[PDB]
Amino acid sequence: DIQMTQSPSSLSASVGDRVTITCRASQGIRNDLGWYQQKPGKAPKRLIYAASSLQSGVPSRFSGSGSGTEFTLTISSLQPEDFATYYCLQHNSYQWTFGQGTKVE
Amino acid sequence: DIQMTQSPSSLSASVGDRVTITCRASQGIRNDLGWYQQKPGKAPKRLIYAASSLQSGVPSRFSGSGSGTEFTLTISSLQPEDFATYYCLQHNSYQWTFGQGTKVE
Amino acid sequence: DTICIGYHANNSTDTVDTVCEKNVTVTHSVNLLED
Amino acid sequence: QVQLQESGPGLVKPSQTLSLTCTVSGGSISSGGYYWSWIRQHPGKGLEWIGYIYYSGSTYYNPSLKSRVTISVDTSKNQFSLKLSSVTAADTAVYYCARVPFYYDSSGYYYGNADDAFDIWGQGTMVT
Amino acid sequence: QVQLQESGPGLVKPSQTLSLTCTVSGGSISSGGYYWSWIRQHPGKGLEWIGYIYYSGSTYYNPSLKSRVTISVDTSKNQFSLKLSSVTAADTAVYYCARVPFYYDSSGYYYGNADDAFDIWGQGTMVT
Amino acid sequence: HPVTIGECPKYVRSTKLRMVTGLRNIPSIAGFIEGGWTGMMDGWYGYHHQNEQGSGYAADQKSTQNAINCITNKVNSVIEKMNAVGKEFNKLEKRMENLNKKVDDGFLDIWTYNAELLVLLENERTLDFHDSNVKNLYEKVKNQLRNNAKELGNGCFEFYHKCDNECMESVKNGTYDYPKYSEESKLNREKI
Amino acid sequence: WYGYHHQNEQGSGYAADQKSTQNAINCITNKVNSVIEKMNAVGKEFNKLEKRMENLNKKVDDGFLDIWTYNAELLVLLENERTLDFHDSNVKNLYEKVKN
Ligand SMILES: *[C@@H]1O[C@H](CO)[C@@H](O[C@@H]2O[C@H](CO)[C@@H](O)[C@H](O)[C@H]2NC(C)=O)[C@H](O)[C@H]1NC(C)=O
Ligand SMILES: *[C@@H]1O[C@H](CO)[C@@H](O)[C@H](O)[C@H]1NC(C)=O
Ligand SMILES: *[C@@H]1O[C@H](CO)[C@@H](O)[C@H](O)[C@H]1NC(C)=O
Incomplete structure (x- = not known):
């Protein structure tokens, strides 16, 4: 019954800005976290496996770090096609719980 | 209650002579013997660690060998500043026992 | 009445490299390079 | 390339059951090494997990929505199916139906084809 | 550089106790892992072992002279002390107070400074 | 710089070359399965005991001395086994200049690769050596105690009988009397 | 790569230990990438009166090739044995954990 939290819910920045975003868990989840990017009216896509490993085909501007209770995702520079919503998904136990959601604008 | 023995108690030689001196133990002491050099009216100084390893700073004229019941110390060449008394200290058990003493002249 | 067997640790932050893992924290290490 | 697609009626009255089938095209x-999962999203809410099944028939279901759920795999038809009940406005x-890998193998040393390490998702079907 | 020195009264009548303090200057x-040891020598005799203590407080004493001996370590004052009794002419x-290392590390791999592998001895105090 | 005169160290194109002499640092009483001990400062391996009279740490000096000996021999062998000023050419000796660069740049790659392999394999050997030494101490304590004590997992033993300080250091130095404390252990084992 | 098999009243079936398989995948990936990473001419012409320079150039070219071939064959043959011993040790750790 582990629950996620994300902050802040809204991110507003111009093109070329660094965005550091946090996912926080109460329990001691060891590097079990993934980041999903959802376009409006479209299925999510995977970005990071196990909070520090990028999927093949992912551009190098996306990076991830963090361990234990907290994890962070960093975007070095924005683009006009980066309007999406980002979720953090844990898979420590058999129960799967997502993040609430963080809109970027 | 292990007891050491040394022989002979007196050594007389000229400058440049090799001196071989023995410390003998009854029990099977595995390389646990150290050689101390005492000036008259002065504190001793360690020469050999664990019967085969010289301490840093000791000149190379001093050498040691031996194992088990018997151990030997060899001096290649004497000097006028080598007038001292030499002891063998064992630390196999928790009890520490020294040598009786060997004066060099 | 217990007896346990373990090893020794300190605060050291020296990191070495192995064939499985990179950046492995060790208690003591020696350096062989001069710069 | 592996593609997942969904089929369902989409016209469900209250206090009646609901079935969807996710089918596979390709491999x-x-x-x-895969977890075959159903994940849902309400329009105007966030993503919420329904449940997953392994190849052999083991199942794991959400503790909150453990009321009337059924998942089933037909290997010969390359299909798996989900059964719910008492579908209200919430x-x-x-x-969405998804294929999540067990392991992360970036350089291709466990799953041989590079594609076999991709979290391929479904198109998504809105059911009202 | 670590230096050991000794302090004591030196005027002891028979059938009365005796105390000495060895203090540390430097590190x-x-x-x-050092034996903190007391070793004695009669003028006109050989070197004889009194006993040693470790940082924790474990003590080991000579079996022959186990009559009235006490060793004690004060860490904050960097001192250790020896207590005897019934001091006769023998x-x-x-x-002498000595710091004997546990291990022999010639190249400096265990004890990091190379002065930390030295059997530093005391100056020596005549007590009559 | 590769051009050196005198007694000089060998040039390599490496940024870091570090060799392990100690153990892994996993901080945080259980034994070696759970982790390492910060409070032990007088050795690399050792024991922790708790009884009626008190509790405290110790050290196994003979295993630490053997570890120090292997580490010293290994690092000295690495130093011992891996024990120019420049040339000028004119415009019509280009083949000589290219051959001289080829020789100078071909030896340096080989020596850099050899140094980096030696460090990376010897680190693994050192860490496996430390793990095997801790397992050897656990096996010796198990073999001497036999059935008088209960394993809680996690490298620890529970004494069925009463074990004071002399009993603990009799287990420690390697001379433990099996028939002396058998009967109370048998009664306490059968009564549970 | 590693797993369990169980049989009881309700049925029987296989499983897998994902955390040991992930550790094995990590070591194998790091090992092969290190082998690739560590081990990261057009020809010359000489006339008849420079035979010594030609022989020196062939000595250099044929002496580097032997060293690099030996280095490659030796690295592959030690890492194969290390990989197989690593897998055997992992299976032993699983058996010890279930025993304990
Ligand atoms: C291991 O420790 C035991 C004590 O548990 C030592 O036995 C002692 O030996 C001394 C000297 O002979 C005696 O004065 C003590 O009375 C003994 N203790 C007991 C409880 O009998 C033993 O000598 C030690 N072994 C080694 C090799 O040091
Ligand atoms: C570890 O702690 C000691 C305690 O005083 C300190 O002196 C030392 O600097 C610390 N080591 C590091 C690497 O910070
Ligand atoms: C290891 O640490 C160094 C320096 O802190 C860093 O440059 C490198 O990226 C790290 N490697 C990994 C795999 O984290």
């Missing part, structure tokens, strides 16, 4: 239901939502 | 009492002698 069929592979047997080595349950009228968009459903 | 203090180090938790690195007990009037020279006392």
Whole structure:
């Protein structure tokens, strides 16, 4: 019954800005976290496996770090096609719980 | 209650002579013997660690060998500043026992 | 009445490299390079 | 390339059951390293997990929605199916079927084809 | 550089106790595995072992002279002390305090500074 | 710089070359399965005991001395086994200049690769050596105690009988009397 | 790569230990990438009166090739044995954990 939290819910920045975003868990989840990017009216896509490993085909501007209770995702520079919503998904136990959601604008 | 023995108690030689001196133990002491050099009216100084390893700073004229019941110390060449008394200290058990003493002249 | 067997640790932050893992924290290490 | 697609009625009255089928096109239901999952999203809410099944028939279901759920795998037809009940206005939502790998193998040393390490998702079907 | 020195009264009548304090100047009492030992020598005799203590407080004493002996370590004052009793003319002698290392590490791999692998001895105190 | 005169160290194109002499640092009483001990400062391996009279740490000096000996021999062998000023050419000796660069740049790659392999394999050997030494101490304590004590997992033993300080250091130095404390252990084992 | 098999009243079936398989995948990936990473001419012409320079150039070219071939064959043959011993040790750790 582990629950996620994300902050802040809204991110507003111009093109070329660094965005550091946090996912926080109460329990001691060891590097079990993934980041999903959802376009409006479209299925999510995977970005990071196990909070520090990028999927093949992912551009190098996306990076991830963090361990234990907290994890962070960093975007070095924005683009006009980066309007999406980002979720953090844990898979420590058999129960799967997502993040609430963080809109970027 | 292990007891050491040394022989002979007196050594007389000229400058440049090799001196071989023995410390003998009854029990099977595995390389646990150290050689101390005492000036008259002065504190001793360690020469050999664990019967085969010289301490840093000791000149190379001093050498040691031996194992088990018997151990030997060899001096290649004497000097006028080598007038001292030499002891063998064992630390196999928790009890520490020294040598009786060997004066060099 | 217990007896346990373990090893020794300190605060050291020296990191070495192995064939499985990179950046492995060790208690003591020696350096062989001069710069 | 493996593609997952969904089929369902989409016209469900209250206090009646609901069934969807996610079907596979391409490399069929592979047997080595995948979690076949259903994840849902209400329009106007966040993503919420329904449940997953392994190839052999083991199942794991959400503790909160453990009321009337059924998941089933037909290997010969390359299909798996989900069965819900008592679909109310909170349950009228968009459903997604997904293929999540067990392991992360970036350089291709466990799963041999590079594609076999991709989290391929479904198109999504809105059921009201 | 670590230096050991000794302090004591030196005027002891028969059938009365005796105390000496060996103090450390320099790198203090180090938790690195050193015997902190007292070793005595009568003027006109050989070297004889009194006993040693570790940083923790474990003590080991000579079996022959286990009559009235006490050793004690004060860490904050960087001191250790030896207590004897019934000091007769055989007990009037020279006392030395010594720091014997546990291990022999010639190249500096265990104890990091190379002065930390030295058997530093005391100056010696004549007690009559 | 590769051009050196005198007694000089060998040039390599490496940024870091570090060699392990100690153990892994996993901080945080259980034994070696759970982790390492910060409070032990007088050795690399050792024991922790708790009884009626008190509790405290110790050290196994003979295993630490053997570890120090292997580490010293290994690092000295690495130093011992891996024990120019420049040339000028004119415009019509280009083949000589290219051959001289080829020789100078071909030896340096080989020596850099050899140094980096030696460090990376010897680190693994050192860490496996430390793990095997801790396992050897656990096996010796198990073999001497036999059935008088209960394993809680986690490298620890529970004494069925009463074990004071002399009993603990009799287990420690390697001379433990099996028939002396058998009967109380048998009664306490059968009564549970 | 590693797993369990169980049989009881309700049925029987296989499983897998994902955390040991992930550790094995990590070591194998790091090992092969290190082998690739560590081990990261057009020809010359000489006339008849420079035979010594030609022989020196062939000595250099044929002496580097032997060293690099030996280095490659030796690295592959030690890492194969290390990989197989690593897998055997992992299976032993699983058996010890279930025993304990
Ligand atoms: C291991 O420790 C035991 C004590 O548990 C030592 O036995 C002692 O030996 C001394 C000297 O002979 C005696 O004065 C003590 O009375 C003994 N203790 C007991 C409880 O009998 C034993 O000598 C030690 N072994 C080694 C090799 O040091
Ligand atoms: C570890 O702690 C000691 C305690 O005083 C300190 O002196 C030392 O600097 C610390 N080591 C590091 C690397 O910070
Ligand atoms: C290891 O640490 C160094 C320096 O802190 C860093 O440059 C490198 O990226 C790290 N490697 C990994 C795999 O984290």
